[PDB]
From a paper:
Most of the characterised Tlps are dimeric membrane proteins that comprise an extracytoplasmic ligand-binding domain (LBD), the transmembrane region, the HAMP (histidine kinases, adenylyl cyclases, methyl-accepting protein, and phosphatases) domain and the methyl-accepting (MA) domain, the latter transmitting information to a signalling cascade. H. pylori tlpC mutants are outcompeted by wild type during stomach colonisation, and TlpC modulates the chemotactic response to acid. In common with family 1 histidine kinases, the TlpC LBD has a dCACHE fold, and is composed of a membrane-proximal and membrane-distal PAS-like modules folding against the N-terminal and C-terminal halves of a long stalk helix, respectively.
In this paper, we report the crystal structure of LBD of H. pylori TlpC in complex with a small-molecule ligand that co-purified with the protein. The TlpC LBD crystals (hereafter referred to as form A) belonged to the space group C2, with three molecules in the asymmetric unit related to each other by a three-fold pseudo-symmetry. The ligand was bound to the membrane-proximal subdomain. The lactate binding site is located in a pocket formed by residues F202, L210, N213, I218, L223, Y249, L252, S253, and Y285. The carboxyl and hydroxyl groups of lactate form hydrogen bonds with the side chains of N213, Y249 and Y285, and with the main-chain amides of L252 and S253. ITC measurements demonstrated that each of the N213A, I218A, Y285A and Y249F substitutions abolished the binding of lactate to TlpC LBD.
Residue numbers in the entry: 28 to 170, 175 to 271, 276 to 293
Write the structure that this text describes.
Amino acid sequence: GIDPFTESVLQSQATELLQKKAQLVSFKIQGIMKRIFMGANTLEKFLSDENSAINDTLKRRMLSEFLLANPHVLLVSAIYTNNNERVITAMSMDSKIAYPNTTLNENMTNQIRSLKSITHSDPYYKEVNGDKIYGMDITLPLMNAIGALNFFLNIDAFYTDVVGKKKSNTFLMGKDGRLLINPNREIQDKILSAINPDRRVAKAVEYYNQNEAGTLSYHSLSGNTETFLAIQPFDFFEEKNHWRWAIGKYVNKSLVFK
């Protein structure tokens, strides 16, 4: 406390460690998401093939295998709009893969036929078997499009990837400071600046918007104290803003400085 040398050393050490840990979490998430999108690309080639010996049954098998390999995906749907309009859906709930019957509504329909690049929805709670599951829809055009591939990314399935096996001071942030994952589940889907008066939050969101890693001092909700907070932004999808998340990790100044 009394010593500026010690303080500088301890601070620098603690904020470097914070950033290192946040980078590891984000790298793990990116790896998970890379596998999702690679598989979705593979599925798109099979589901959109002109001259296929593949019937709806074998399409179902491949969709269910996608789910087996990617447990962070709750369901996946091959939606055809061209002719013989139909929805083929595999869904993974509990440990069993079902094939619910979806009828294509005019809501989904035209959005799909004019679709010419990948999109995603805003995060939302989907009701399933009386439970709300936090996630988002991701939609790829079946290629001029003959229909669409849609899957529901289960954001809740990333809970342990973000927070760890033990509770920790780690969260996943989305657009404008929205909390996608938080150890305190009840502040999920909340805007951070709307539930935290600390105006240094803006600098967090700004690190996010600028897309570089950075640290800042920050008053936490879960600890109600002064912390260092690291922000690690990363794209959860790569094309060549819209597909950007960030890991937040923080530590009590009272702990850093003895």
